[PDB]
Design a protein around this ligand. Sequence first.
Ligand SMILES: Nc1ncnc2c1ncn2[C@@H]1O[C@H](CO)[C@@H](OP(=O)(O)OC[C@H]2O[C@@H](n3ccc(=O)[nH]c3=O)[C@H](O)[C@@H]2OP(=O)(O)O)[C@H]1O
Ligand SMILES: Nc1ncnc2c1ncn2[C@@H]1O[C@H](CO)[C@@H](OP(=O)(O)OC[C@H]2O[C@@H](n3ccc(=O)[nH]c3=O)[C@H](O)[C@@H]2OP(=O)(O)O)[C@H]1O
Lengths: 523, 523
Amino acid sequence: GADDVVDSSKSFVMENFSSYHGTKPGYVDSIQKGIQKPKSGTQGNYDDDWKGFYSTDNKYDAAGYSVDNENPLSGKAGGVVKVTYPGLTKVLALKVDNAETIKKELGLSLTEPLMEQVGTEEFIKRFGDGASRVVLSLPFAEGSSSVEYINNWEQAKALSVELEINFETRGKRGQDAMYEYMAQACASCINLDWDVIRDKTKTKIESLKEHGPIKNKMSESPNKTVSEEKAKQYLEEFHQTALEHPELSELKTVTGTNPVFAGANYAAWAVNVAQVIDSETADNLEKTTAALSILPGIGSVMGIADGAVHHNTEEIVAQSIALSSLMVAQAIPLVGELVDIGFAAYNFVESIINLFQVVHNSYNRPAYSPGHKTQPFLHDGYAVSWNTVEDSIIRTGFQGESGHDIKITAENTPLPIAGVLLPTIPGKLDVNKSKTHISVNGRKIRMRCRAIDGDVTFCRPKSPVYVGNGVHANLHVAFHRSSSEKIHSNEISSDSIGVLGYQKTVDHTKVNSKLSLFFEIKS
Amino acid sequence: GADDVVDSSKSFVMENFSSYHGTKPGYVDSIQKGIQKPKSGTQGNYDDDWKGFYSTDNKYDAAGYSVDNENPLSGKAGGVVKVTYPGLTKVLALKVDNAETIKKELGLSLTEPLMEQVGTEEFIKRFGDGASRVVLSLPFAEGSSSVEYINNWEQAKALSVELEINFETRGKRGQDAMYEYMAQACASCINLDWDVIRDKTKTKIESLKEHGPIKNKMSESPNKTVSEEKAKQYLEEFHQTALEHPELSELKTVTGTNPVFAGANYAAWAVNVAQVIDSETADNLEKTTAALSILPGIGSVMGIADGAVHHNTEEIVAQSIALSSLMVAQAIPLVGELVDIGFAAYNFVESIINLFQVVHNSYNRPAYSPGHKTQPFLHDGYAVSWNTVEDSIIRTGFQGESGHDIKITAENTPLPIAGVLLPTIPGKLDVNKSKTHISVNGRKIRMRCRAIDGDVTFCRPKSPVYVGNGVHANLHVAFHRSSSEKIHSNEISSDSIGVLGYQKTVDHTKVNSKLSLFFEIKS
Ligand SMILES: Nc1ncnc2c1ncn2[C@@H]1O[C@H](CO)[C@@H](OP(=O)(O)OC[C@H]2O[C@@H](n3ccc(=O)[nH]c3=O)[C@H](O)[C@@H]2OP(=O)(O)O)[C@H]1O
Ligand SMILES: Nc1ncnc2c1ncn2[C@@H]1O[C@H](CO)[C@@H](OP(=O)(O)OC[C@H]2O[C@@H](n3ccc(=O)[nH]c3=O)[C@H](O)[C@@H]2OP(=O)(O)O)[C@H]1O
């Protein structure tokens, strides 16, 4: 019966039904000429039942689909278009997102893709209520109030497309236009001017560089490869000297307020950057970002602690970015490969501004339920937990696909999630690569997934993921059943899902923290 | 056109569309038999255009329509029923609530009432989008995100009616049941168990009456008509004496912490009660609430200051009510009537528990845009301002009706609002009595309006209204134009809206605080 898969309180027929779509660079304009199924690719979904044109009711969540796919962490943001169906459209809200159950319950052909059937005249006759087409609607994410729409590709052809925003038109550096647009969602609400910040930072670096005492501290540098401990201890002195520069007076004042802002954290974080940025990464902004994005300790330079963004002005922020930057340049000779020059003031600053931006976006957002609902596993500051007990089970007979939620939070300052390792049984239980994602305070982030050793699939978030006091995430795992064969309990290669946290040195080697949650493969 | 008065983003066709309606004591059962227009009465509205059956999407707002209309302040609540239309129903959201404009814009007759025209087959063929009937839809109130629905009376005969809650059935005391139902709204939540508070109040009273120092302080009472000063002087020493009983231990720790909590304030509140309670009033709970509800200083007793409910447990509350009760008993002889401590430990405490219930209900709600948008008129702690400049102008040629908003706030503690004096031109410009209301933090309060001298209409709120730090009101004035003959500026008798606040003594006479706002009759 339809009644088991459809929520009537969320289903309605509406005239001139509009929704937004995040558009990539290079498509903003062409997409205003019409919606059409791409000639190749996944055409909306890894699973054929779910291929269709996707939109959402919130233009800021649409904006989260606008960044250049080739350079997801630093690339350009395209835009957001509004798509409108002329006349009457039936929105049919689903209670489950299991295409199979949807076909069983709606009495559909289980041999034909679900979303293709949604565009048939008979489905429309049956479920449309006098409308011209039906658009399937599902919740957008945990910790989100938005909605996601799944349109039939043919039916999408009737959509009228207008521009909502073209981020590139602004002529802004990096992903400024995009994050400033999304910052409008809270009228919460940190919206710094990153241009003024870049200016002030640049100005202050030049100034600190010339400060008599700063230059003398500089002279005391080993300027050669010294131990991690020696490099950090010189940077704790370098930081102390520099915090007395009048252009850093306000920072100096806050530094004592929270232990998160200590000299010792500026030095641990500066040495760790130097250590992970080689000639190649330094020369690439996207690599630089991927590399900084997995370091622990960003709450010190960002002034984020105990669930609040303390460094909340273009000035204390410019002061913090300048000091750290200046510290990275000193740490490069002692621990890295390149030199003080270039990177420290260019790619380091640009790349770090994008991470402030991502973390501030989270804090401007409502906190995804702080509390663990099942006992969490704690490690290196993070706490991971199944959202519910059923999320922990893989029913051996599940048909179609299954979804699993796991709450991830960290205890205090911004700690990163590098990736997720998911168990598979190739050709029976596969990862659905379009539906697995992580939602941070409701912002849904897609993943890039690949096969690794032992029937495990490694998924990396598309943009940086940070959890902390105030910023919690939901990992949503979508499994696809590509075979009607029997799935046994002792048949899976792996029986857990791993969470990769920040990168730390173990055995003098950089590794990523790792928390595992185990599955119960059961009938 | 339709797009000039229809909000399409809020207009849709839904299957089995349900809403809620507050039901009075005696109708909770018969209403479930069917929605039928009363044989007599205003049947939904003072204005013919607007007569129809009213519902809302929110069951707690529906709850605010359940109280017996003979004893509005203290009578019992009946309940809420869910009304559902079978099949398909069109919801037509309106950008305006002027029926003339909606008729003119939707190309309706101007000779026939709007909601009557809403149930015709023609209107339905036109605006229904394939639905069996059309329901009008309007914002519920300022400071609220609820929806009001207005059904056509005959179309409403199709509604199936279900019980949602019957408060009488709960068997509780006063409007307890109604009030905890509403507390479910927010889980800002303070949901005291008043049954436990009624008992600890009783227990503290007795314990206090047998207290050594208490009884002797009592012995020192002049026990007879003395002045306001001597009565107040004795009562403060009384308070100190009682504030040292092991049982008011909690309340003592908190008396000194905030000035609002001082004995001097318990003593003044006590003298004012004893002064205002005569034998006739002391014998009627309804009349006790009305009397107590217009007094200043109730915040001493409630422990409410600086935008916080300090007395937030059933123990300090009982403690506070006990002490107040005793003091009220002591005050009765000195500055009151033969209405002694009988009233003190009974009606005054039942009456007082209900007003904590109203104020606590406002605090559990989201504070209505605190800022005054045009310069406020200040006075006796209150601040009243036109919502917008337009709300202050009565355009001479307005056709149909017009509404005006006034924000009302008080500076700190709970100050009441006794009523509002509205101007009129009795043939042409009338107070629409159904549409005129006060909205307190989104809680919508109806008015009982009467004609007074000088072409003024006095409107009283159906339930107690209090403003303060964190509880803001919007007074909504709905005028109705009874005549096409245009208005002349010097035609009108009063050119102001008067706000009546708390009761005070002027020239040994009890009068109410009064604030005025001046209208502008333009074109
Ligand atoms: N004229 C056009 N008509 C149709 N598509 C066009 C057109 N021009 C460009 N496209 C792009 O084509 C894709 C498929 O429709 C979308 O981007 P993507 O990089 O594949 O977008 C990446 C993913 O985001 C989804 N997504 C995009 C935006 C949004 O707001 N919501 C959402 O879920 C896509 O379906 C896609 O899923 P899959 O990769 O799982 O296929 C879309 O923007
Ligand atoms: N079988 C019946 N069929 C229909 N109505 C019945 C039936 N039996 C009793 N009634 C009552 O008759 C009135 C008209 O519907 C309502 O109460 P009221 O005391 O007049 O209710 C007082 C006012 O509250 C309005 N109001 C009530 C509840 C609600 O949630 N929303 C709303 O705005 C009413 O229209 C009314 O306006 P007017 O007072 O301006 O007429 C209703 O409860």
